[PDB]
Amino acid sequence: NAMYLAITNIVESSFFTKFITICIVLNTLFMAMEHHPMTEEFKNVLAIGNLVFTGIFAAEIILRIYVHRISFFKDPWSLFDFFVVTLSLVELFLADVEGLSVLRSFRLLRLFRAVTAVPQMRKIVSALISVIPGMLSVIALMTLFFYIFAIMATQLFGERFPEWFGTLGESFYTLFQVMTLESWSMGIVRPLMEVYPYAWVFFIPFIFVVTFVMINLVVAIIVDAMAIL
Template sequence: VVMDPFVDLAITICIVLNTLFMAMEHYPMTEQFSSVLSVGNLVFTGIFTAEMVLKIIAMDPYYYVQEGWNIFDGIIVSLSLMELGLANVEGLSVLRSFRLLRVFKLAKSWPTLNMLIKIIGNSVGALGNLTLVLAIIVFIFAVVG
């Protein structure tokens, strides 16, 4: 059931909706709107956790970790669960930004995005020295002010 194309489509729709929910966060938010986004976060985290658990059960843990997208998804789900568990701890809002990486999972069902990610990945290796020089320049300007 978890490997069904309709389940993949439903998960893809959930990824897009989750991204939209994260994009709707702003300052200052009303208490009601903030609670709607919190409930949405809980629902989406529950859906993605259920997908991961069902895939582990269906595929066996050994075969589950053989596929790169499953490892990626498992890391993102684990970080989302960690964020929910540590919701009252200050300064851990950076964990929320890792959920945005789930958008890259769309590359699995979107061939053009998949090709673009592969091209960017290959280019980063070739442009390593240029990237290092650019990072140094940005750092210098950040220090200087």
């Protein structure tokens, strides 16, 4: 276990770990060299740079598993790192990854684990981690509201125009559009008033109930800071 613990100490060395994060932020700046005026000859060195960056990450994870069998695997953060670099390797395995490879850009969020050092950000991150479950519950209830309302809508207005309400997928997307108060009037509801003169009585109570629910979300976001302090 001699070189095991020795090189394992070099793994847990902050020089190495912070070097990995410098490689991470340098990889993100390497993706910030995704211009369109890049040249095709300089594109090949960009490709081999992505190659060697992903190789460095794969080397990092094969060392982290050469130490840990299941101990890192209990930790979901390590599972997140392993999962995203293996998805980068499936990008390196003939798959139609669109851009999911630079989901490893999300590895930059480990710098988030250093940005908490501002004394307000401690309260902010404890607050966000505290309000995750209640927000998941209000996402559930608001999606239920969307579910019944979009079913009503796609039965109602399916015929004269199915571009907005033909399926349930596109009717559901359309009610997310009318949720965020953008062109429901000029883009959506005024074409309905051109045909159906009694759909404003559908849409206006929908605006009230989901403005209600979203403001309720804001309230259950508010409560944490008076809960802590």
